[PDB]
A paper describes a structure:
The C5 reconstruction focusing on vertices of full particles revealed only low-resolution density for VP9, except the N-terminal fragment containing one α-helix, reflecting structural variations in the head domains of the VP9 trimer relative to the N-terminal α-helices. The α1-helices from the three protomers form a tripod-like conformation, which is situated in a central cavity surrounded by pedestal domains of the VP4 trimer. Residues from the unfurling domain (D71, S74, and D78) and the pedestal domain (K466, D499, T500, N502, E503, Q525, and K565) of VP4 form hydrogen bonds with residues from the tripod to anchor the VP9 trimer onto the VP4 trimer. A density map of the VP9 trimer at an overall resolution of 3.8 Å was obtained by iterative 3D classifications and subpopulation averaging of the VP9 density at multiple positions, allowing us to resolve an atomic model for almost full-length VP9 (covering residues 4–283). The VP9 stalk adopts a helix–loop–helix–loop–helix conformation, and multiple residues are involved in interprotomer interactions. The extended loops connecting helices α1 and α2 serve as the internal hinge for tilting of the C-terminal parts of VP9 trimers. Considering the large number of VP9 trimers on the BAV particles, the structural plasticity of loops in the stalk region of VP9 may facilitate the interactions of rigid head domains with multiple receptor molecules on host cells with variable binding orientations. The viral infection is initiated by VP9, which recognizes and attaches to unknown cellular receptors in a multivalent-binding manner.
Banna virus (BAV) is the prototype Seadornavirus, a class of reoviruses for which there has been little structural study. Here, we report atomic cryo-EM structures of three states of BAV virions—surrounded by 120 spikes (full virions), 60 spikes (partial virions), or no spikes (cores). In the full and partial BAV virions, genomic dsRNA segments and a number of RNA-dependent RNA polymerases (RdRps, VP1) are packaged in a double-layered icosahedral capsid consisting of three proteins (VP2, VP8, and VP10). The spikes protruding from the outer capsid shell are heterohexamers composed of a VP4 trimer capped by a VP9 trimer.
Residue numbers in the entry:
A (entry chain B), B (entry chain A), C (entry chain C): 4 to 283
The structure:
Amino acid sequence: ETELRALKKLSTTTSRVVGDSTLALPSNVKLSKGEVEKIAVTKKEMFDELAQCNLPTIELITREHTFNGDVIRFAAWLFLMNGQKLMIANNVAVRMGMQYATNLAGNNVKITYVTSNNVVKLGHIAAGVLANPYSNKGSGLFITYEYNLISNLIETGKVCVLFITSLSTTASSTNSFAYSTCSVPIENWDFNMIKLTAETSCASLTAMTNLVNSLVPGERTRPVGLYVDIPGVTVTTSASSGSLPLTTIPAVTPLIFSAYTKQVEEVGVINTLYALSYLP
Amino acid sequence: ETELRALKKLSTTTSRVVGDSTLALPSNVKLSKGEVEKIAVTKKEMFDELAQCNLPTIELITREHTFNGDVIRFAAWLFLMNGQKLMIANNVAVRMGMQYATNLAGNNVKITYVTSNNVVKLGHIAAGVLANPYSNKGSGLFITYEYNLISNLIETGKVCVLFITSLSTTASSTNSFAYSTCSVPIENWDFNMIKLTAETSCASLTAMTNLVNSLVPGERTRPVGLYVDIPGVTVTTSASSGSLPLTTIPAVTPLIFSAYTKQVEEVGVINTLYALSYLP
Amino acid sequence: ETELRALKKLSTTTSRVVGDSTLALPSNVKLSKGEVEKIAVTKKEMFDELAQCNLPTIELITREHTFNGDVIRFAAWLFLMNGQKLMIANNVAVRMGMQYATNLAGNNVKITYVTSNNVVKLGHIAAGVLANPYSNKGSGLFITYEYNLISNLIETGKVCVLFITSLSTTASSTNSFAYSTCSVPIENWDFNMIKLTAETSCASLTAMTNLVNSLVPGERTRPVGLYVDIPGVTVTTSASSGSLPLTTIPAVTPLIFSAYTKQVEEVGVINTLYALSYLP
């Protein structure tokens, strides 16, 4: 029975040591920790990027604006946040767990964190003075607090999100524009549930499908529709206006998320920025 | 009877649960899935960045231009594509699987996806009007369809790869430049094979190495040579020019890949952008 | 006897083919290489980003300025290094194992690699002509070789690190500015040790926290203090000057690391850039 004791240890560990052979080990065989350290990218290694002074944790001031050290999302989110050629002025994204966030003009603003049932839900900042109005035919996503941009009316305790778009192709000189809007209660608010989709079926997407079909086949562009998964929200579109719905946003108006692309073809870039901005 | 049964499962799975000690387990020890789910960053976690509404897959429109979710790749490729300080005008990279791609001027246009044997291989777009001609001691890589920038002669069923370079350093006011053009058939085309190398031996590097020797000893620069692994390729490197072989690209000229840097000293980033752009 | 050899294989090999089932296998269940090949993003895949022509290793020139393939390290570091707004002129960071590095004006220059006891400790370059004076009410980190920026005196065989800051908030019109300085020998030099912290206790932080506390309510800002882990280090923090200590630096003055943000609120990006720039 003592043979069982020794032969049992063969299960616990491997006689093999780490090395180049670990790369060439056949796929069917099992692995030890040392080899798995080599083969797969370790969570330590990503944590090792910002590690200084061999501290147990990375610097607090760094963890604030790096999504608590999630470097992978931080890199891609950073460029789309600002520096894109086609984005007008500076896209405004209020990331959670932050002291300051830039506004449309570019001044960093102390963020008013809204607390829901003793839990911080989201924060907003003053819009500031927009550099320029949104000129060309492009799409954009807008999220504001206690305000409706189309109606210019304030609803206390309610968050309204607007999506604007240009149906016509940028090359096509014909001008057709529409938008989708909805108001969400403060309580059941989750950034994850909202997205811009071209495949998932929703009421906004249905409107865009036939609305583009209204235009000539040469100038058609694939529909991009607002989708909201949260209970208690109704998405309302608009008829084909043919003129841009929103040109500028007042500074006094509270702001949560706002991003517009000069051309419509890079509409999906907006959704990517929204996806990266808030962790689910 | 049951002693074999239990002892097999005893070895087969792990009794230990995940925790802090999971990090401190011996390297030679073997591990469970929950342990590996902690130690290494997962496919899901990388996939989790773009996940919305807990959907099985990422959004289609985001899936198109993010290399089908290669967020690790997408971030680095993005800045080199747009916003490089030394890059002139807008370098053009045509990403596969996408409807639109920006041209030199910055106006995004529809892509003509070439299909070979009922299988797509590459896409090209109109060059557009260049913002400014390339005027400095710099190097660039150029890929065009059905055309030869050296001879300005149209091709049929042929894709020509051109690589200009700056023999002198930035400080060396002495002016001398060379190039290495190649033409490849569509049938044998494969992006991954071609690269810019300073160590791998090739015909272009063979000439390029001696060319800097013609320079004064103080003026030497590290050779950078075009290398093509595609069988049936012809590589030609002309003598020193003393002037820029190419100044501007005609708008009607078809384009696939084009990028140039004012300073030759950053020629390496050109290869990186080409490496990032196309998945092997 | 045969059972022992037979049952050993059951230990070493899972005998289960990879698939979606492997994705859904229980966490307690042990797994083979094929699962870890799937479950975790491999070191191979990160190598695959720059992989080309199926070469056993990545290109030399590409690996030189990409931290030898640390793509994610290269990604986030790239945008912060240059191209971001709220950065005066160009941030200058000299990466190790490099031929050229950009100056303040943006022209890349040869790097004098300082080798100590037959080990290359660091490298420095000529500062070049600064584009503009260092704006207003911002913070920055400065590292110079054989020099003292505040004292403008040469110290052979000693490297000095300087930190500047603005106590007052950008919104507050009141003006209060302080700084921290240290002189480090080259022999004990190690990049990873030094950092900007808001939680770790250090002499520089202790001097600064009461200083901003001396400011009236509503004007106080989170203290960010120099912390140096290298033994034999002195840190000095003067009284609140009320005016910017430094505006421009001479071109002839050697420069190791230099970064400055127009707004103080983005102090973290300064530490973030330093953390990314040099591997531990």
